[PDB]
Symmetry: none
Subunit: 213 residues, 2 copies
């Protein structure tokens, strides 16, 4: 077949070394060669992002330009409706075909919440999901009847991600980074440095556009 393709979403307000370094360390132990970044739009019942739809795309494009691994998909940005995770994966399965391996990247704090998701079941119908292990936390699912759901689809051999179209779940050892989007936004208002939490081009764009200040 062709190579496995991984998808990796978020708001990215702003994009930071956490998103990038975490995924490219994953790809060095799993053999991933191509990752597509799908930025979201926040549904109106939540706080809306500080950086607008355009700036977040610009900030992404800058961090990603020197990195062949990543590529950018602006579906949800050009989309009328709010971003629903199972809808984007149902589209990629349609366009890409049924025989190509697809995987969806999530953190551990979001897998312990996975059944809280709209069409949480229909996700594993289209792609794998690679869970970024948060070191120091257990795998405790809220209702221990989809603690079985985690056990029915868990695999420890990454070959399954590369040799099957969908359906498996992988937990991956990631490093720790003490950076988030709220940290950086706060470190900016407080006036403390950030040349190690943020790509240097992205931070220059932030200073030039006056965001988070």
């Amino acid at each position: 077949m062709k190579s496995l393709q991984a998808l990796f979403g978020g708001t990215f307000d702003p994009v930071h070394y956490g998103h990038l370094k975490k995924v490219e360390t994953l790809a060095n132990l799993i053999g991933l060669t191509r990752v597509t970044i799908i930025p979201n739009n926040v549904p109106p019942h939540r706080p809306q992002p500080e950086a607008n739809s355009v700036q977040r795309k610009h900030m992404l494009e800058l961090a990603i330009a020197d990195k062949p691994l990543f590529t950018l998909d602006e579906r949800e940005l050009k989309r009328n409706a709010p971003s629903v995770t199972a809808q984007t994966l149902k589209e990629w399965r349609q366009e890409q075909g049924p025989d190509v391996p697809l995987a969806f990247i999530i953190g551990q704090d979001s897998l312990l919440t996975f059944p809280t998701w709209d069409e949480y079941e229909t996700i594993l119908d289209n792609a794998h999901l690679i869970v970024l292990r948060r070191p120091g936390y257990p795998l405790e699912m809220a209702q221990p009847q989809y603690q079985q759901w985690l056990e029915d689809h868990l695999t420890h051999n990454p070959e399954d991600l590369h040799l099957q179209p969908a359906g498996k779940i992988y937990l991956a050892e990631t490093p720790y980074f003490n950076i988030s989007a709220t940290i950086i936004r706060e470190r900016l208002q407080n006036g403390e440095s950030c040349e190690d939490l943020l790509p240097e081009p992205v931070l220059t764009y932030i200073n030039q556009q006056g965001l988070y200040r």
Copy 2:
């Protein structure tokens, strides 16, 4: 439709008249007829309570026994995982339905997540004397976008709107209570009488 159902969580180590008399006052200004107290369990990355999961249920049961407005729900005490509010709420939205109104009670100091408005309203116990200051002024707009001053909107919509309710002041917290108990100064004004008897029977907070 059905009645509005309000949920009110917390550690309750112990429960006291500040919790009770603040919400039944709310109940009189909002017109809600049912409140479900949902005691929580603290994840180990915080100092753990002094009274254990059984004793805190008991002190709760004694306090709620004679109040029809309140009913208890020990989802989180019998659950393996740490209690996460957006997890319990969507469970309530799951078990109750999409057309009944739901609301969640929180103090003002604790709200200062996004996911709440998916399934329920959020009624903020206003800290009297303090302003509406949100830290990062991008969900200060979110606070302003979904605020409402007509309690009807809470009774006619399943979720989405935010109400800030005037509550009275009491000089009573579990930290106040434990210290007045560990040194030995009285507390018959801060707790219902059956709860103080359970505390004095169980050797709690000394």
